[PDB]
Write an enzyme that holds these catalytic residues in place. Structure first.
Site, PDB file in Angstrom:
ATOM      1  CD  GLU A  35     -11.866  -4.027  -4.506  1.00  0.00           C
ATOM      2  OE1 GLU A  35     -11.237  -3.142  -5.118  1.00  0.00           O
ATOM      3  OE2 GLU A  35     -11.337  -4.693  -3.586  1.00  0.00           O
ATOM      4  CG  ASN A  46      -3.375  -0.947  -8.687  1.00  0.00           C
ATOM      5  OD1 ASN A  46      -4.064  -0.587  -7.728  1.00  0.00           O
ATOM      6  ND2 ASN A  46      -3.823  -1.803  -9.610  1.00  0.00           N
ATOM      7  CG  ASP A  48       1.504  -2.894  -9.848  1.00  0.00           C
ATOM      8  OD1 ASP A  48       0.463  -2.213  -9.876  1.00  0.00           O
ATOM      9  OD2 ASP A  48       1.524  -4.063 -10.293  1.00  0.00           O
ATOM     10  CB  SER A  50      -1.173  -3.283 -12.405  1.00  0.00           C
ATOM     11  OG  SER A  50      -1.340  -3.048 -11.008  1.00  0.00           O
ATOM     12  CG  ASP A  52      -7.026  -2.243  -9.219  1.00  0.00           C
ATOM     13  OD1 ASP A  52      -6.337  -3.272  -9.335  1.00  0.00           O
ATOM     14  OD2 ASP A  52      -6.797  -1.388  -8.347  1.00  0.00           O
ATOM     15  CG  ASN A  59      -3.892  -5.682 -10.922  1.00  0.00           C
ATOM     16  OD1 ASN A  59      -3.695  -4.469 -10.985  1.00  0.00           O
ATOM     17  ND2 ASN A  59      -2.933  -6.563 -11.071  1.00  0.00           N
ATOM     18  CG  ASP A 101      -4.801 -17.403  -7.090  1.00  0.00           C
ATOM     19  OD1 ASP A 101      -4.270 -17.780  -8.170  1.00  0.00           O
ATOM     20  OD2 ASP A 101      -4.139 -16.874  -6.151  1.00  0.00           O
TER      21      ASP A 101
END
Ligand SMILES: [Cl-]
Ligand SMILES: [Cl-]
Ligand code: NA
Length: 129
Positions: A35, A46, A48, A50, A52, A59, A101
């Site tokens: 990562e 990203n 979108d 966003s 990380d 994120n 989650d």
């Protein structure tokens, strides 16, 4: 801060990630590896919009506030900059929240594509834990 393999395996163990929610520590290390390449200051935008952040690329669309991801939540209740520290407490506790989650570590696309189902134990092989 760019952690060494064993050095991060260690800190993670302390911060209680080892087998946290069923994931052997070698998974957390593997995820860190692919990562962020073990770097605390890794950021990646990203499409979108966003971003990380950190050792585990947390994120902003959901987990931290960076003040530049419209309509995102800050569930970990932290500034995304906190995930960029030499101190891995924030990334950890947040990862704890993430991996809980319901979807476990699949939340990490490098984990799913690069660690999941692979001999993850190797990542902690040789380390003094
Ligand atoms: Cl935002
Ligand atoms: Cl799970
Ligand atoms: Na956010």
């Amino acid at each position: 801060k760019v952690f060494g393999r064993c050095e991060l395996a260690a800190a993670m163990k302390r911060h209680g990630l080892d087998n946290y929610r069923g994931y052997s520590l070698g998974n957390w290390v593997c995820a860190a590896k692919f990562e962020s390449n073990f770097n605390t200051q890794a950021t990646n935008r990203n499409t979108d919009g966003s971003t990380d952040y950190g050792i585990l690329q947390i994120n902003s669309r959901w987990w931290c506030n960076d003040g530049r991801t419209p309509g995102s939540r800050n569930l970990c209740n932290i500034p995304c900059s906190a995930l960029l520290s030499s101190d891995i407490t924030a990334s950890v506790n947040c990862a704890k929240k993430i991996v809980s989650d319901g979807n476990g570590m699949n939340a990490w696309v490098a984990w799913r594509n690069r660690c999941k189902g692979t001999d993850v134990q190797a990542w902690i092989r040789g380390c003094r834990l």
